[PDB]
């Protein structure tokens, strides 16, 4: 009974925290991979321009350079929706539970 | 390891001590052995089926004995004694003389003819009843209680057992066996009065149901008892994978919503307020139909289910897809959450098919109702025992002065050696009535030789030496009857019973 | 007596810490076989022969011509390098998160599971 | 049941059986046969054939067209 309604607002209210700094982080995340674009679109044309991403840096042209990182910004982007969906979602359920938790109290 | 003769004197010695002291605690008029614990604990009764336990037991036929007596406890539970009685008789009297005229053989078969003899007479000297009369009834059910003495509550409950065990008597093979109880559902109940009482119609539903968020009452709302399934599936159909981390409870829980929904919505397709719910039960199902304000009662027996499937007369529903009144909660039907005492009770009444009721038992308390229940549990079956068998027999001697004439003349013209089991089966018939005898506590020699007369021109077809009248008296007049099966459920039973032991000379371990 | 309630509190305290930081370590660890498993996409892609620029030492990064992007390493055993085909070595990266994956996993269970038996701790404290 | 008497060999095999109860068939002539050790029941698609809801009746259809 109440234990399982008082399971479900204790999984949510701890869960539904993180989501929204989440899409926060991300939002951040699309801008520098979008301006690290930039940096290199600044150079109109750079072939010694290197992209790699960590320790390494391998040489490319700029192009798909940028190919890659107007995704990059896309896909530090993306999960921003899914992590503000992830967010919506608890809101919502921390209330049943916390609901059927009063009206089985009630009944 | 035993033996032959000797297994042969143990059956007889032993099942004539096993035939015997209950007969003395037979009767309305009866004696009550007392039973000694080797500790000293004392036992009065006279139920042989309590008296076969304290008792230390050995001999393994005598076990046997327990048998049948239990398979018969299990039947009646009445007679268990009276039909361990005549397997005593039978045993005793031509066993060891026909064996020593060497047979079981000759024992076994006459006993086919003593029984057949009887069935006739048992349909000539049984009369029909009105089970359409529950007063024609009463008066058994009135007759059934008060051998052991109690009348006090019975006298109603011997109404309400009528009542009901007609109703919690539907039943077809098509041939329409009716041999339906678990229709017929009690209730231990405080406060009330014994001598207030009822039957309510399908299943009430009192014992693990107090459920009070069944809501209370349920006008026409449905019960939905589910063999669904109704458990979450966590993915699309099924079940996905655990909750170990935020990102699974966000997808997955969803998921689980909908497969309780579209059930729960199949279960609202026959539109429910009260859902018991007892396969796929999950902590979102009720939640579910929490949300969907539809109670749904979990942590529940199927058995409530099955006394609820007999509450509205329905079956179980499997079906995830379309769920329905005939599938669940048949007919309009109520569901209510009833306080005899202050004891939470769901009452689903109104199956879907009529002869619904159960018995709702109200004592001043528990206990003083426990006296109606265990009585009325008498009662109740006797009803279903008539109901099972319209027909009746003025009883004591006339029961069993009857046959034994037409098996002796039996034995006259079949003249064979199976005429010394009809000449064994003769008086076995009137132990009972010497019990009788005892009962009134007479002259059995003269009251048997009275009452072999008295079926020498009456023919014994009511005429009995009854104990608590004392004297060689029509039965129906004064009133002595049981449904016909009853007489012939002891008497089929210690026949087969005796033939059983008959069968044995070896005990081998 | 009295200290007692008072040392079991934050005693579990910084299991929490302990873990919670052992599985954010097991976060990082894992982040980097990826690293390695998605820069051989990479050298397959531009080259054998495109400039490379890796680190020579501290602040210093050293160049180099791409060469054999199907010679990619693995390492493991105590010592040991195994060098792996394109193919391979993204596998054993795959694998050795997968075995630091409930390694890092089972912490969490473990992390959360020592704050509320502080707090039980707690609990009786202002109890 | 009927007659003791009736009691007959009969040609190949009287199911015990549930019959069809739809309205089926009492006679189909020279039976291809399935017989099934298996039932064929139902389980729940979340997603059936289709997609679009054009009415309330399309949003049932969905997961009715399974």
Redesign the interface.
Same mark, same amino acid.
């Given at each position: 009974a109440f234990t399982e309604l008082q399971a479900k607002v204790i999984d949510t209210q701890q869960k539904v925290k993180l989501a929204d700094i989440q899409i926060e982080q991300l939002n951040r995340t699309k801008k520098h991979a979008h301006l690290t674009d930039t940096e290199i679109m600044t150079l109109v044309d750079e072939t010694?321009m290197?992209?790699?991403?960590?320790?390494?840096?391998?040489?490319?042209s700029k192009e798909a350079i940028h190919s890659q990182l107007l995704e990059k910004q896309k896909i530090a982007e993306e999960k921003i929706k899914e992590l503000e969906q992830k967010k919506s979602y608890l809101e919502r359920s921390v209330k049943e539970a916390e609901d059927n938790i009063r009206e089985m109290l009630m009944a | 390891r035993e033996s032959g003769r000797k297994v042969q004197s143990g059956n007889i010695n032993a099942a004539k001590t096993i035939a015997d002291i209950i007969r003395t605690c037979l009767g309305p008029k009866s004696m009550m052995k007392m039973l000694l614990d080797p500790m000293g604990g004392i036992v009065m009764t006279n139920d042989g089926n309590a008296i076969l336990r304290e008792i230390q037991v050995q001999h393994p036929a005598a076990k046997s004995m327990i048998e049948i007596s239990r398979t018969q406890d299990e039947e009646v539970g009445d007679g268990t004694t009276s039909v361990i009685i005549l397997a005593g008789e039978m045993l005793s009297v031509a066993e060891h003389f026909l064996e020593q005229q060497m047979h079981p053989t000759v024992v076994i078969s006459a006993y086919r003819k003593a029984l057949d003899d009887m069935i006739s007479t048992l349909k000539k000297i049984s009369i029909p009843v009105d089970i359409s009369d529950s007063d024609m009834m009463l008066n058994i059910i009135n007759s059934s209680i008060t051998t052991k003495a109690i009348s006090r509550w019975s006298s109603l409950a011997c109404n309400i057992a009528l009542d009901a065990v007609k109703m919690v008597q539907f039943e077809e093979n098509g041939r329409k066996e009716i041999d339906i109880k678990k229709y017929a559902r009690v209730e231990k109940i405080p406060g009330g009065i014994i001598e207030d009482s009822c039957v309510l119609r399908g299943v009430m539903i009192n014992k693990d149901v107090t459920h009070p968020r069944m809501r209370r009452y349920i006008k026409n709302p449905r019960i939905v008892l589910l063999d669904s399934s109704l458990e979450y599936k966590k993915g699309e159909s099924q079940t996905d994978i655990e909750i170990?981390?935020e990102e699974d409870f966000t997808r997955i829980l969803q998921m689980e919503e909908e497969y309780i929904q579209q059930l729960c919505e199949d279960i609202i397709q026959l539109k429910p307020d009260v859902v018991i719910t007892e396969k796929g039960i999950s902590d979102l199902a009720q939640h579910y139909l929490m949300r969907a304000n539809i109670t749904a009662i979990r942590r529940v027996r199927k058995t409530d289910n099955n006394r609820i499937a007999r509450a509205c007369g329905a079956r179980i529903v499997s079906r995830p897809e379309e769920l329905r009144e005939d599938d669940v909660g048949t007919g309009a039907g109520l569901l209510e959450i009833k306080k005899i005492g202050d004891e939470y009770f769901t009452f689903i009444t109104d199956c879907k098919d009529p002869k619904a009721c159960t018995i709702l038992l109200r004592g001043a308390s528990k206990e003083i109702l426990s006296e109606v229940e265990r009585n009325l549990q008498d009662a109740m079956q006797v009803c279903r025992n008539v109901l099972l068998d319209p027909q009746l027999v003025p009883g004591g001697g006339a029961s069993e002065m009857a046959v034994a004439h037409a098996l002796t003349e039996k034995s006259k013209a079949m003249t064979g050696v199976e005429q010394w089991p009809y000449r064994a089966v003769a008086q076995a018939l009137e132990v009972i009535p010497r019990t009788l005898i005892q009962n009134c506590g007479a002259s059995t020699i003269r009251l048997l030789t009275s009452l072999r007369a008295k079926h020498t021109q009456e023919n014994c077809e009511t005429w009995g030496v009854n104990g608590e009248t004392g004297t060689l008296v029509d039965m129906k007049e004064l009133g002595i009857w049981e449904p016909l099966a009853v007489k012939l459920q002891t008497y089929k039973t210690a026949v087969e019973t005796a033939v059983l032991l008959l069968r044995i000379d070896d005990i081998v371990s | 007596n009295l200290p007692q309630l008072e040392m079991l509190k934050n005693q579990l305290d910084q299991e929490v810490e302990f873990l919670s930081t052992s599985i954010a370590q097991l976060k990082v660890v894992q982040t980097k076989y990826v /690293?390695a498993k998605?820069?051989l996409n =990479? *050298?397959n892609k531009?080259n054998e022969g495109?400039? *490379?620029? =890796?680190?020579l030492t501290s602040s210093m990064?050293v160049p180099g011509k *791409?060469h054999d992007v199907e010679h990619v390493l693995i390492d493991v055993g105590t010592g040991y390098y195994v060098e792996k085909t394109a193919e391979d070595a993204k596998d054993f990266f795959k694998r050795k998160i997968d075995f630091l994956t409930k390694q890092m /996993?089972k912490i969490?269970?473990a992390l959360q599971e020592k704050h509320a038996m502080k707090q039980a701790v707690m609990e009786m404290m202002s109890q | 049941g009927r007659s003791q008497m009736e009691s007959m060999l009969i040609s190949g095999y009287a199911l015990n059986c549930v019959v069809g109860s739809q309205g089926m068939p009492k006679r189909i002539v020279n039976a291809k046969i399935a017989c099934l050790d298996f039932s064929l029941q139902k389980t729940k698609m979340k997603l059936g054939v289709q997609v679009v809801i054009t009415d309330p009746e399309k949003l049932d259809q969905i997961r009715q067209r399974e």
């Open positions: 010694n290197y992209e790699g991403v960590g320790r390494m840096f391998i040489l490319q | 170990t981390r | /690293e998605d820069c =990479v *050298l531009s495109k400039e *490379l620029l =890796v680190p990064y *791409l /996993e969490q269970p | -």
